Amino acid sequence: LPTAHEAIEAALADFVKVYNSKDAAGVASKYMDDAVIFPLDMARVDGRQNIQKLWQGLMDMGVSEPKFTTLNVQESGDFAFESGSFSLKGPVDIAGIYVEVWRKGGWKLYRTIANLDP
Template sequence: MIKLIVTSFLSLLIMPTAVLAGDLEAEIRAIDAKVQQLQNTGDAASIAKMYAHDGVRLPPDGSRIEGREAIQKSFQDAVDVGVTNVKLELTDVNGQGDIAWSIGTYSIDVPTGENEISTFTGNYTIVYESDSDGVWRIRVDTWNDDAPEE
């Protein structure tokens, strides 16, 4: 359950924003920075608003999370267990028309015991859609954890 909550807090991972002048990569990088801020301040409600009304999260080893209310709950669950220090690193972005996608890596800190913090790392993929007002909304996001170190 903690793994689902931890990974639910990710994805982000990326917050939609009004389309600005400039290239798509710069726009997505700005979205990443805003999502990091909201995740690290525990603002699950604002993150959920960045998804399409029928947005979908596909957590590893977990059930499909669909719709803003369920998405907000998944982020709030992560806040409640103490997920902190969310870092997103965009590695690839592309798009065509009103659809864009990104790939990146993440790391997060999660309480794993009394006075213990573990850092989880992994990869994410996000699909965005620009709505009629030119605002990028997350349609689908998914992520996976890196293999544990041995």
């Protein structure tokens, strides 16, 4: 049987592929339009337009090799709840942990909360 864990790993594999193609609109299309990203102790990023700008900004400054490790996923109603970790390479390691909620749009990101390691 298929698990939500496996479905979310597949969605994030595609996320990474689209990021590496420098397609920020493509990345942003994997979010709900009213999605929000809350990087702790930093400014919240609200809505798909601003989320596109975030990922575009990371592309432009040369951030590369995103890796997302899905640690736990549960499914409930139209939603998937995920714990994971992330690392990216910047011109240095950019790494941390997140929880996020996906909604069946195909799974799409709705809420992300993330912390960058101190």
